[PDB]
Symmetry: C3
């Protein structure tokens, strides 16, 4: 098999999202910029390492790449590559805007092409099955569009960012009904339970992208999106003993994107003097959870239970 | 069997919602306050009686309470207790704001805890079934959140109200697709047909809550929500001969919450000089339907066909 | 059988939508009004011819009319009659406002009555099946409401237009999830594949209607709706070789409504100086695609492959 699962890209993805969330606290806290820089450098290094590993996979393990691309459930994890590329471009924008824009456009084109080629291929039917309705499907259709929208808004293309954000939002509210229904009826296998954290992702990623696009203005839509995000967060907090029934694993980094987007939206809300206490709680909770995830990953690395 | 089904809480729920709807007409019509006071007193008395009966059930009939709580379909009717508590707090706010705040917070915490503990256990799967996709599922996930949002907005917590309202709105949008697909596909048994009136609830409850949070401002969203609510109302008016195929019963009070929320939104729209004729029609229709429901309940009581 | 399928009403429907889209360019170009007049006249003549044919069907082929009305999948194509009537009224409004108002109201009442009588009758269940979840279901529930909203906004009833538009929008958001899940799971048989173009319709019809009611003001909602519409357009562009696997046919006119609504929204966006390049591309693409559809229809007519 391949040592690096394609789902391990959630490590740099979550770290970069948290780096951006901290970066938004540049003014109110002098060390916020330093924390953002450290997180961004770590995420960029991890992303470079994983990109090299995946290039090696393509060069010498193309059979596995084809198998995961054509699978109706495993294909959605290939969408983490463009998402993490766009997040790394967002990080680099603070240093070299040209390289940041190049990375952002590469990731946006890649994710849009992947969604067009593969997500639309499912409509042909036959390959997708009722048991393939997993939370990971958010990555190509929802998370990618929100990340591209936020990145484009960072570059100044606010109308294109609005287009991408709306595509992602409508795809999210169009897919989540059937996903939650499947979860209610058909449960979820222990190996796929760790991906339940992606359910927390869209609600907070949407508000983060919206606040990025509209210059951090806390409209009614942002409050509504936090309402749903906090409902989802409570639901998943209740289910966490069930999610980790088989034990801790690197698959829990799926919660990282949702937690980091929650932190980013918390900074945006705090800047707006809206629900300051709830914003502080959300930011602290996201940071603590991602820190626990980092500690778990370090423990796995020391123990050797990280690579496959 | 207990003489009081948990679904009988829709009587005080509908009466209190109608009381608030009338209360919103305090200034325009001198006897609107008197009608609101009468309806609120009746709803509060009925709610106190039902709370005492349910406490008796918990004390001496806890087996039935456990059975209904663990049932994937009957659990949703326990969400009527916090909803009615919050509505009674809304009523009492006109007299004793402290007791009203206590009741509203108790109901909000109770419904949020119930949704976290039970509506999220369904995602584990195996207990919820495709045949359990009933309109009553709106009560814990949707109706409770909207009622809590409106109640909090009544206390002055407009941002927290916005959070709760958004949670309820997105939960409604996420659940209704599968519910309507099930209704189209698998029909609905005569015993559960009376609960079809809960389909009318979310569309009008959402607009009522929205007009409560935003100071009764008739935005585009309120007009959209009435559009869908009236589409649903026509759909259910066509189906009413089918809904009462086996005859009238106390289960028809499910329509009461939707009708009362329609009346409340009608008052809000009339105050805004938006669709005044439609608002008058909606208010009169809601009042007449709830009066017919009250007459039916009184006839059942006199006939002795009310308690089980 | 009867020579004219009920789905052939998409020819006048698409032509009239394109005529309105061009008419919106009256001021910018001198010949935009001439093109709009030509398209509207052709659409009106075709609609009159098809109305006469359908009246003949009702008089002497009522068995087929009843069979298609009671069919859970074929009933949705009867909604093309009121939709095309409302579009023809919109066209005529530029010449004789009284006849335009009469036609618009006739179509609105007809489509609302059809939706109430038939779309709500499906909730009884037992006739609708999981394999009847076809894209054509958008016509009675979604497309009709959007067209009615646009037509009413044309007459000056902007609040009633908002009601209808919201009804259509929420109906679309509520139906699309299960439709796309069915498409992913099952597979539109070749004879029903041509109707896949109706998936492109709601996203752009919604934004066209919204820009009609709100005086062509490009708001965040319009940008979001284009985001989803372009995602859908790319998805269907990828699938087009699969959609026409068995060859081109008159069923491809289902794409006509979506393309014409895209052109209309493109004109509205261009007027607002929002994404002018994307607006130009969308308008040109819609016109070229509808022109190709017209050429295909003319070739079918010359080849004698149009009527059954």
């Amino acid at each position: 098999p391949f040592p690096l699962p394609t789902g391990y890209f959630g490590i740099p993805l979550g770290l970069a999202a948290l780096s951006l969330a901290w970066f938004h606290l540049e003014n109110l806290f002098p060390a916020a910029r330093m924390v953002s820089d450290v997180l961004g450098i770590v995420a960029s290094a991890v992303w470079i390492l994983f990109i090299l590993m995946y290039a090696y996979k393509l060069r010498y393990y193309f059979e596995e790449v084809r198998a995961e691309y054509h699978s109706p459930v495993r294909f959605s994890f290939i969408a983490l590559i463009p998402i993490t590329t766009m997040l790394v471009g967002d990080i680099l924008y603070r240093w070299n805007p040209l390289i940041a824009e190049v990375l952002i456009w590469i990731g946006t084109i890649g994710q849009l092409l992947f969604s067009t080629l593969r997500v639309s291929e499912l409509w042909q039917g036959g390959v997708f099955e009722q048991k393939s309705t997993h939370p990971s499907f958010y990555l190509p259709a929802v998370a990618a569009n929100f990340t591209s929208a936020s990145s484009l808004a960072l570059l100044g293309y606010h109308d294109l960012g609005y287009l991408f954000f709306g595509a992602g939002m409508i795809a999210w509210i169009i897919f989540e009904p059937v996903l939650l229904q499947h979860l209610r009826i058909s449960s979820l296998e222990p190996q796929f339970r760790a991906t339940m954290g992606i359910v927390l992702a869209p609600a907070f990623v949407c508000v983060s992208a919206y606040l990025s696009i509209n210059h951090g203005e806390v409209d009614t839509l942002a409050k509504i999106l936090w309402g749903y995000g906090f409902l989802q967060l409570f639901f998943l907090l209740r289910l966490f003993p069930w999610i980790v029934e088989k034990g801790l694993n690197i698959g829990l980094w799926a919660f990282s994107f949702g937690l980091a987007s929650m932190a980013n939206s918390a900074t945006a809300f705090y800047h707006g003097n809206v629900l300051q206490g709830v914003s502080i709680f959300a930011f602290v909770f996201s940071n603590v959870m991602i820190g626990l995830l980092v500690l778990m990953t370090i423990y796995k690395l020391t123990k050797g239970q990280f690579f496959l």
